[PDB]
Amino acid sequence: EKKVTQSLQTARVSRRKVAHVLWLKKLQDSSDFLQEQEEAARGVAALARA
Amino acid sequence: MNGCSKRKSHRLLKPVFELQQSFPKIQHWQGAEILHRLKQKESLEALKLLEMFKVFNETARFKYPPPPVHSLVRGCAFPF
Amino acid sequence: KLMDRKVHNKYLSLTQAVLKKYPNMRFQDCYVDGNDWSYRADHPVMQFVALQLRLMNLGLDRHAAFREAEQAFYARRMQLEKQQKLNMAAAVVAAAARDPSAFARSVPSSSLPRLTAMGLGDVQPLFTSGQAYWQFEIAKSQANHLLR
Amino acid sequence: VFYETFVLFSKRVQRADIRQLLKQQEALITKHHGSMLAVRDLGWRKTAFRVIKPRQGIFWFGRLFYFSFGANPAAITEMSQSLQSTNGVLRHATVRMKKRHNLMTYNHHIHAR
Amino acid sequence: KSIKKKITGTDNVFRHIMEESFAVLPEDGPEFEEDGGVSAKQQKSQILSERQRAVLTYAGFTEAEKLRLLDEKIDMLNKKLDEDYELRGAPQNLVYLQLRDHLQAAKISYREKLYVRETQKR
Amino acid sequence: SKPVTVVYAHASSMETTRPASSASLSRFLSNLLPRLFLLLSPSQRQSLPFNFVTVDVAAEPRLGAFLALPSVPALVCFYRKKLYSVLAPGASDVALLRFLKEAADLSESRVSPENVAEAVHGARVAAWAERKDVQCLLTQLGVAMTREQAEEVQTLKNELVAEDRSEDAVLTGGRRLFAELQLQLTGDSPPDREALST
Amino acid sequence: SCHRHVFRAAPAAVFASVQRWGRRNNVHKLTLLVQTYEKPCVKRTRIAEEKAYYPRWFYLRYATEVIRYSLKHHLRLGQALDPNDDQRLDAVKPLRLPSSEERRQHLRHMEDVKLVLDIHSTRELLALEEGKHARWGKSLSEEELGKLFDAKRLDL
Amino acid sequence: KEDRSPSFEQQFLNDKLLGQNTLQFTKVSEKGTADALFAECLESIRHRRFKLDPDVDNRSSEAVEKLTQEERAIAEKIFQRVDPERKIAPRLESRGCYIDPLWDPFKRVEELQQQVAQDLTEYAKLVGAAEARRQRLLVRASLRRQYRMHDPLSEGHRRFFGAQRADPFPTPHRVHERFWDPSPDVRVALKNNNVPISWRDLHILHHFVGENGLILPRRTTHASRYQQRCIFKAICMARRMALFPYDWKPTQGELMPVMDPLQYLVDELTSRYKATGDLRADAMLCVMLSKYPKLNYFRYLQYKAQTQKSEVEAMQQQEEEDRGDFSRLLRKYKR
Amino acid sequence: PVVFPHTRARAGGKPIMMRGKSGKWHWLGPYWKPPWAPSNKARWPTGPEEWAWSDPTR
RNA sequence: AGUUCUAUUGUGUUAGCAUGGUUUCGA
Known part of the structure; x- marks a missing residue:
């Protein structure tokens, strides 16, 4: 019977971790400077190679 | 023809003499000084009125008088 | 006296939920002694909870008792209280002897029975929420002044 | 973890200075394996009482700024001491970033209802 | 503050918005709407119309009761228009005269609607 | 049906008297989308790789709350009835192209990169990128399909995560090892004991 | 700090309000304590004694109010x-x-x-x-x- | 038309009298669907019928006091438990949720109001317009004086009748923590939409401070033990940042949370449009929508998106011409 | 299954406040619940108030 | 009773800051 509880524990922690990912996604979206610096970085990369 | 069915008898409507608060008993000598100070900031005195409610504590030189027994017996005799 | 025992009062916790969903129970029987809201056996709040505990003794669960109690008391309002009120109100309309046309020496000339049909004169309705009665008295006053 | 800092500028602070100040700060962030989050502005703010800072003068108002970042916990001390030496900055404070209460995800429906 | 030491070197944003808003709504235009807010809008959704009130009142009635009730109404109405004021042909008012005609037209209209078009549904 | 469905949210009801922003984006979007694939005609709606559907935010209150968009307008994508990245308003021209490029990749001719500058510049009168598949795109496609237990389609994506790349092992390494096990446990014949042990 | 303005009121009446203001904030009590140096041991016992006498005063004050209220109304x-x-x-x-x-x-x-x-x-x-x-x-x-x-x- | 001046534009809705204007019946149009024709046709039977009525139905009598001083206090206090987040008021506009539309006692007013207007046949019949005008002023005065008669729970009622003030029992100030009745205004601010109070909430910390700027005790603010410690920290930090006074209460110019200045404006305007429906506010937001796309407009969009009830109402009216009353009976058939 | 409770004795000692003009704690602070205290339900029968917060995640 | 994870923190240590009684200064 102990093995049965093992599966339940994995599901319980899995749901808790899922909610944590949503909070971090908000920050990314809400962040302006992060996106701005990231955007710029990419552009220069291709120009140097071309 | 839609009035109340029961008469109005609530305490709020009709003020009465009572104490809506509980507190531990206090020594007679301790509370006597406090009451005197309030009276200085200007029928039976307030000290005697509060004693009937059993507010003070039974100290060494102050004990609650016993109830009237010798002046409260009223019996009737009849055959059986 | 050895058989005496102390039991837990279950009404303290059960009554909290009843008032939360239906907080319009304190208005009834407010001016009577014994009732506090800062309750008597006759109070609606005590009556409703009494049935809930009695039903649970048979085997019903705590949540199931609420549904059964709500329906049991609902019928009394619509089958007895509503019927009684409506029956009595009907008789008022019949009292049209004051009109001159009621007896000849025809189209009625006075609107006395018409007003009583909508429940405005000596025939008042019975609501459940306390807000309805608060606004009802307002209407009365409004119409009273205009008459003058 | 994430961190927040509220910096109150003065009237004697131009846009030139603000850009310089922020650039300096970013150096430390990167040093300690960090990255800037976002930078915003709050405009001017009225002060309840006069501020008397030595060797600076007297001021009645200033420009309130806000910027979020993230770095090693040991970088807070270095940052705090740098602000004090620099002119213009009369008052500042560092507040740790919370999960629910924040200026990023929670900024709507505060005063209204 | 009277003292010329407060915030001065700033741009007014409030006025900008207002200025640009006159295009969609002139200053001389109304300041309030009849619909009102949430409190007002709820009222309009509860009040009923004159025609709606009549249908609800007589919703529980049936054909066997409506026809009998209507016939009683017109029966007494006519009695008060032929022998009420003795024999007259020019009353000063047109209260019952105008009500009698309206009720009469309804009865005639009902006769035309037998089932839909024909006696049989085939 | 198409698994990818792009939902274009906008509020043009308030701008019926004076277009400010809602109609500005429609003019450019309607002229650029057709050129990059070669509101819209029904004939050209079938050749697209995703289902383009338009919904009015300020017309239906039930839908407005479900999306919960802090801004207006904004492009919202979907994949097998699931939330995806949302493009915020006010972005640059490069951001718009990025969003469209990834939209057509999830479903899996296209305009070659050599002729990308002319298409974008020529569509602005009305008034793809050289990067390969994204690492996150492949991972998101394998995590959801494994529940369906595919046979032939699962092998293809398994082989496209390791070949002449040797650049991403800390993120895609975990799923690569477990992906092979599922394939071996799908064949009708018994698996090989030696293969599983290794 | 407290500031009051006199408007259609006698100086004596206004002065009676500011006097009671200090009692709430214990302005007088704090002014005298700082004048003289008090040993820490004395404060240890004085701080505890004030936590038993003041609470008792509030209960007795309410009792006196009922006596006056009932005296003007009689009944019991x-x-x-x-x-x-x-x-x-x-x-x-x-x-x-x-x-x-x-x-x-x-x-x-x-x-x-x-x-x-x-x-x-x-x-x-x-x-x-x-x-x-x-x-x-x-x-x-x-x-x-x-x-x-x-x-x-x-x-x- | 003839000389027809209903009471809706000659008696009330001017100066003081426009403060409350409760709608009785809806209006669709003048000439249109069958509802418009019925409204005027039913009116035609009326008017002239008011002249032949008898004088016996006039049951006019003096209005004596209804609620006494000792009784109004109990009703006022017991009515706060049902809704501790709002103040008691005569919300006549939301009577539908408590009174059936057919059994609405307000219906009488409609009939009565029309009568008064109709009764003013003396405008030019007997004395002419000369004296008519004079009499009009008389009625306005009468109604204005008696405007307080429609609120027994209000202080106006007592002033009219001239009754002495109440004498409630002296309630002790020192109470056990079990019993507490915080004021409605401060109770709503404590919850803060289930968000702990921080240093940014400057508009809420101003209530928990005395005249001298000292921290109030737990027996005055009436707050829980957990939030009491949090509040002390928020106010303490705000003072260190030079964002709060030190010996006096804040001013009107510092009652704003720590947020985007632009956000404040937008948020502020949204409430006005929802309470009274300010036209100016709506216009402002419209422009700002495009100008500042990077702003939150969830509440503004939701309110406008909820206006679909007006469009659906047209379908009900259209089917009403064909005797389509089945839509109303089904909704009422709930039981 | 049948299991009996365990001993209430625990490590450490009772709270102690350092003497002298320097007020400081020695082992434990004021927020210390002894092992013989009653259940929290009986000590706080009132429970959270209507205006209390339903999320103490500060 | 004990270990892990999660919410909670006027309990130990801690260098710069803000405010304040006393004290000090007088282009």
Whole structure:
């Protein structure tokens, strides 16, 4: 019977971790400077190679 | 023809003499000084009125008088 | 006296939920002694909870008792209280002897029975929420002044 | 973890200075394996009482700024001491970033209802 | 503050918005709407119309009761228009005269609607 | 049906008297989308790789709350009835192209990169990128399909995560090892004991 | 700090308000303590003693208020509360309207302008209900409006 | 038309009298669907019928006091438990949720109001317009004086009748923590939409401070033990940042949370449009929508998106011409 | 299954406050629940108030 | 009773800051 509880524990922690990912996604979206610096970085990369 | 069915008898409507608060008993000598100070900031005195409610504590030189027994017996005799 | 025992009062916790969903129970029987809201056996709040505990003794669960109690008391309002009120109100309309046309020496000339049909004169309705009665008295006053 | 800092500028602070100040700060962030989050502005703010800072003068108002970042916990001390030496900055404070209460995800429906 | 030491070197944003808003709504235009807010809008959704009130009142009635009730109404109405004021042909008012005609037209209209078009549904 | 469905949210009801922003984006979007694939005609709606559907935010209150968009307008994508990245308003021209490029990749001719500058510049009168598949795109496609237990389609994506790349092992390494096990446990014949042990 | 303005008030009246302001904030108590140096041991016992005397004063102050309030109103409360006591209206005249069952009985023991006023008043009511004078005055019986008129034909 | 001046534009809705204007019946149009024709046709039977009525129906009597001083206090206090987040008021506009539309006692007003207007046949019949005008002023005065008669629970009622003030029992200030009745205004601010109070909430910390700027005790603010410690920290930090006074209460110019200045404006305007429906506010937001796309407009969009009830109402009216009342009966058939 | 409770004795000692003009704690602070205290339900029968917060995640 | 994870923190240590009684200064 102990093995049965093992599966339940994995599901319980899995749901808790899922909610944590949503909070971090908000920050990314809400962040302006992060996106701005990231955007710029990419552009220069291709120009140097071309 | 839609009035109340029961008469109005609530305490709020009709003020009465009572104490809506509980507190531990206090020594007679301790509370006597406090009451005197309030009276200085200007029928039976307030000290005697509060004693009937059993507010003070039974100290060494102050004990609650016993109830009237010798002046409260009223019996009737009849055959059986 | 050895058989005496102390039991837990279950009404303290059960009554909290009843008032939360239906907080319009304190208005009834407010001016009577014994009732506090800062309750008597006759109070609606005590009556409703009494049935809930009695039903649970048979085997019903705590949540199931609420549904059964709500329906049991609902019928009394619509089958007895509503019927009684409506029956009595009907008789008022019949009292049209004051009109001159009621007896000849025809189209009625006075609107006395018409007003009583909508429940405005000596025939008042019975609501459940306390807000309805608060606004009802307002209407009365409004119409009273205009008459003058 | 994430961190927040509220910096109150003065009237004697131009846009030139603000850009310089922020650039300096970013150096430390990167040093300690960090990255800037976002930078915003709050405009001017009225002060309840006069501020008397030595060797600076007297001021009645200033420009309130806000910027979020993230770095090693040991970088807070270095940052705090740098602000004090620099002119213009009369008052500042560092507040740790919370999960629910924040200026990023929670900024709507505060005063209204 | 009277003292010329407060915030001065700033741009007014409030006025900008207002200025640009006159295009969609002139200053001389109304300041309030009849619909009102949430409190007002709820009222309009509860009040009923004159025609709606009549249908609800007589919703529980049936054909066997409506026809009998209507016939009683017109029966007494006519009695008060032929022998009420003795024999007259020019009353000063047109209260019952105008009500009698309206009720009469309804009865005639009902006769035309037998089932839909024909006696049989085939 | 198409698994990818792009939902274009906008509020043009308030701008019926004076277009400010809602109609500005429609003019450019309607002229650029057709050129990059070669509101819209029904004939050209079938050749697209995703289902383009338009919904009015300020017309239906039930839908407005479900999306919960802090801004207006904004492009919202979907994949097998699931939330995806949302493009915020006010972005640059490069951001718009990025969003469209990834939209057509999830479903899996296209305009070659050599002729990308002319298409974008020529569509602005009305008034793809050289990067390969994204690492996150492949991972998101394998995590959801494994529940369906595919046979032939699962092998293809398994082989496209390791070949002449040797650049991403800390993120895609975990799923690569477990992906092979599922394939071996799908064949009708018994698996090989030696293969599983290794 | 406290500031007050005098407007249509005597200086003596205004000065009485600021004096009581210090008592709430203990301005006088704090001013004297700092003047003289007090040993830490004394404060240890003084701080604890003030936590037992002040609470007792509040309870006694409320008791005095009831005495003054009751003195001007007299009366007194007693052990009058009892569950076994139905609070029914005394004399209780207002009652439901007669159902026509008792109306007829009333006329049977009042036939004998003062006492004969009811004659021809209530009698016409009964005739009107039965439909004797007017064709539209006929009412409905109590036995034909509840069996198949309200328990089945309900609007709900 | 003839000389027809209803009471809706000659008696009330001017100066003081426009403060409350409760709608009785809806208006669709003048000439249109069958509802418009019925409204005027039913009116035609009326008017002239008001002249032949008898004078016996006029049951006019003096209005005596209804609620006494000792009784109004109990009703006022017991009515706060049902809704501790709002103040008691005569909300006549939301009577539908408590009174059936058919059994609405307000219906009488409609009929009565029309009568008064109709009764003013003396404008030019007997004395002419000369004296008519004079009499009009009389009625306005009468109604204005008696405007307080429609609120027994209000202080106006007592002033009219001239009754002495009440004398409630002296309630002790020191109470056990079990019993507490915080004021409605401060109770709502404590919850803060289930968000702990921080240093940014400057508009809420101003209530928990005395005249001298000292921290109030737990027996005055009436707050829980957990939030009491949090509040002390928020106010303490705000003072260190030079964002709060030190010996006096804040001013009107510092009652704003720590947020985007632009956000404040937008948020502020949204409430006005929802309470009274300011036209100016709506216009402002419209422009700002495009100008500042990077702003939150969830509440503004939701309110406008909820206006679909007006469009659906047209379908009900259209089917009403064909005797389509089945839509109303089904909704009422709930039981 | 049948299991009996365990001993209430625990490591450490009772709270102690350092003497002298320097007020400081020695082992434990004021927020210390002894092992013989009653259940929290009986000590706080009132429970959270209506205006209390339903999320103490500060 | 004990270990892990999660919410909670006027309990130990801690260098710069803000405010304040006393004290100090007088282009």
